[PDB]
Amino acid sequence: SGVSLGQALLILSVAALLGTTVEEAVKRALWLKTKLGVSLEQAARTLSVAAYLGTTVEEAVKRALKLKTKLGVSLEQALLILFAAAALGTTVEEAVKRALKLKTKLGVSLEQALLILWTAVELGTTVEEAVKRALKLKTKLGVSLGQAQAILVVAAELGTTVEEAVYRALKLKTKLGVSLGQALLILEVAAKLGTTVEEAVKRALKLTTKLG
């Protein structure tokens, strides 16, 4: 029970994505988190997958649950599938094949594999090249693969070099005393909101009750 800064930022991003007020975004998210008994993050993510698919939230969930039972995955994983497949513009079976192809090939989570696939979409590169870049960062900065891919996409959303992205991220981790995760989040949210980092955070803090 409580809103970590992280959750708050995401919800901002959702509010943005839906194009609703952040009061209504958070109302919907907290309503979904209880109705489904998921994390708040997962509730926001579900809102964002439904939007991404151009569907209603029930419809998305109904579909996820047909993939949860059919493939024996977790709900979130089912949502990720749907999202990945959308992004690609393929079928779920194809998406699922490619992801379990990356999962085995690289020794990662299914979730990681999907996200790699989605990063590739955004970067406009091959999945081989995306993994390349992510492994380059992982090593260069001693960061996790997740971080690496995150940085990549954030660098993309900003329309800046990965170097400059890191600079600003690190600069926000020093200036504000956040983790790298948080900084990246903040950067992307602010870019999606079309505001400063300071504005985005102040907005996030209005929702933050827990201490991330």
Residue numbers in the entry: -1 to 210
Paste lines from the article:
Here we address these limitations by introducing an artificial metathase—an artificial metalloenzyme designed for ring-closing metathesis—for whole-cell biocatalysis. Our approach integrates a tailored metal cofactor into a hyper-stable, de novo-designed protein. By combining computational design with genetic optimization, a binding affinity (KD ≤ 0.2 μM) between the protein scaffold and cofactor is achieved through supramolecular anchoring. From the catalyst perspective, we sought to address this challenge by designing a derivative of the Hoveyda–Grubbs catalyst (hereafter Ru1) that contains a polar motif, aimed at interacting via H-bonds with the protein, as well as improving the cofactor solubility in aqueous media.
For the fifth round, we screened a fragment shuffling library (540 colonies) by randomly recombining the beneficial mutations from third and fourth rounds. This led to the identification of variant Ru1·R5 (that is, Ru1·dnTRP_18_E4G/F43R/I44T/F116W/A119V/E144G/E179G/K206T) that afforded TON = 339 ± 34 and 570 ± 25 in CFE and purified form, respectively. The evolved metathase Ru1·R5 maintained nearly half of its activity at pH 6.0 (versus pH 4.2), whereas Ru1·R0 lost nearly ninety percent of its activity. The highest TON was achieved at 50 °C. At pH 3.6 and 50 °C, Ru1·R5-ΔHis afforded a TON of 1,028 ± 159. The X-ray structure of Ru1·R5-ΔHis displays close structural similarity to Ru1·R0-ΔHis, with a backbone ΔHis of 0.6 Å and a Ru atom deviation of 1.0 Å between the two structures. Notably, compared with Ru1·R0-ΔHis, the evolved variant Ru1·R5-ΔHis features an expanded and less hydrophilic channel leading to the active site, which results from the three critical E4G, E144G and E179G mutations. These probably contribute to the increased affinity of dnTRP_R5-ΔHis (versus dnTRP_R0-ΔHis) and hinder the approach of hydrophilic species (including GSH, OH− and so on) that lead to cofactor inhibition. In developing a computational model of Ru1·R5-ΔHis, the structure was predicted using AlphaFold2 and further refined using Rosetta FastRelax in the presence of Ru1. Yet, the resulting models did not accurately reflect the deeper placement of the Ru1 cofactor as observed in the crystal structure. In contrast to the free cofactor Ru1, the dnTRP-ΔHis host protein protects the thiophilic Ru1 cofactor from poisoning by GSH: at [GSH] = 1.28 mM, Ru1·R5-ΔHis maintains > 20% of its RCM activity, whereas Ru1 is completely inactivated at [GSH] ≥ 40 μM. Guided by the X-ray structure of Ru1·R5-ΔHis, we selected four residues (L8, L113, A148 and L183) located in the proximity of the ruthenium for randomization with 17 amino acid residues (except Cys and Pro).
